[PDB]
Homo-oligomer: A and B are copies of this chain.
Amino acid sequence: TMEKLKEIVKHLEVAIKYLKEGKVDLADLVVADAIELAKEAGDKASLEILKVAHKAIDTLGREGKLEEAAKIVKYAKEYVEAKIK
């Protein structure tokens, strides 16, 4: 599916936007929503990366880094964009 892998990228840009101002919880919820949308597509190589990004938020952004978790979210978004093209 190509029309449901562009909503994931649209949420992954809000996630980074929140992560750049300390909104770790809202970014967590956005990534959870993206995982929920990715569970509905036929892709089983981008859902795992989204789960990795969510766990990255949990174990890397709540401790005050906020620079590396954003990087993991950017890597996930770039992987999804590479996949849709």
Contact = CB atoms under 8 A, between A and B. Distances in A.
Give the copy number: 3
A10 interface: yes
Given A10-B58, A10-B62, A58-B10, A25 B36 contact: no
Interface residues of A, number: 16
A14 interface: yes
Contact of A36 (B18, B32, B58): B32
Nearest to A40: B51
Interface in A38-83: 55, 58, 62
Interface of A: 7, 10, 14, 18, 25-26, 28-30, 32-33, 35-36, 55, 58, 62
